[PDB]
Design a protein around this nucleic acid. Structure first.
Ligand SMILES: [Mg+2]
Ligand SMILES: [Mg+2]
Ligand SMILES: [Mg+2]
Ligand SMILES: [Mg+2]
Ligand SMILES: [Mg+2]
Ligand SMILES: [Mg+2]
Ligand SMILES: [Mg+2]
Ligand SMILES: [Mg+2]
Ligand SMILES: [Mg+2]
Ligand SMILES: [Mg+2]
Ligand SMILES: [Mg+2]
Ligand SMILES: [Mg+2]
Ligand SMILES: [Mg+2]
Ligand SMILES: [Mg+2]
Ligand SMILES: [Mg+2]
Ligand SMILES: [Mg+2]
Ligand SMILES: [Mg+2]
Ligand SMILES: [Mg+2]
Ligand SMILES: [Mg+2]
Ligand SMILES: [Mg+2]
Length: 131
RNA sequence: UUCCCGGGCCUUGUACACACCGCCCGUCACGCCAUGGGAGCGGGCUCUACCCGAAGUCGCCGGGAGCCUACGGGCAGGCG
């Protein structure tokens, strides 16, 4: 038997392919399904992805933002059915996979440390030319 | 005729005139009032140094690059 393939097989029913590719440092908008009262709604969480934790179907990513003077971090399963869509709002270029360090940085310092990833921005623009 | 008691005349000092049985000082005791000191406690104002920093004018850029061309330009946008 191949235990890995069995697991991949169980996971296959839940795997997602509709979400855009992004890297740590990119700024991302996650439209997330949420439950309140008496209804469910979609709430956008927009911020820098500081971490992508890979384990295939089980990979998760972490998005950090400042909300009314307070740092907030959300952890999302990359294949969650509660993510309606993810929008790339900016491409950042980091020089490491985990950006924990920006927790200690001023907004000004972060803006210096993560400059726009012009290579991947151009790529986005080259695509998005629809036939 | 020094002393005690009463008085008369002259004079002298007096913070006494209720007139020396006068006036009056301070502790202590009780009561009230205001202030000072006092481990500290609370608050107001202020000064200095540094960290972060909105809006905004100003200055640079405006390109791996968008839009308007009015194209040796402008706006977006970026930096300070
Ligand atoms: Mg396994
Ligand atoms: Mg199998
Ligand atoms: Mg909301
Ligand atoms: Mg942020
Ligand atoms: Mg849905
Ligand atoms: Mg006599
Ligand atoms: Mg006589
Ligand atoms: Mg006499
Ligand atoms: Mg005398
Ligand atoms: Mg006299
Ligand atoms: Mg007292
Ligand atoms: Mg006192
Ligand atoms: Mg006192
Ligand atoms: Mg005092
Ligand atoms: Mg005080
Ligand atoms: Mg004080
Ligand atoms: Mg400091
Ligand atoms: Mg400053
Ligand atoms: Mg130009
Ligand atoms: Mg400007």
């Amino acid at each position: 038997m191949n235990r890995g393939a069995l697991i991949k097989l169980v996971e296959s029913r839940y795997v997602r392919t509709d979400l855009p590719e992004f890297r740590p440092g990119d700024t991302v908008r996650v439209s997330y399904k949420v439950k309140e009262g008496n209804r469910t709604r979609i709430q956008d969480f927009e911020g820098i992805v500081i971490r992508i934790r890979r384990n295939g179907f089980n990979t998760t990513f972490t998005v950090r933002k400042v909300s009314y003077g307070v740092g907030v971090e959300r952890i999302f399963p990359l294949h969650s059915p509660l993510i309606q869509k993810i929008d790339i709002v900016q491409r950042g270029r980091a020089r490491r996979a985990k950006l924990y360090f920006i927790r200690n940085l001023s907004d000004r310092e972060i803006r210096r440390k993560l400059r726009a990833d012009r290579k991947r921005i151009d790529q986005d623009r080259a695509a998005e030319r629809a036939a």
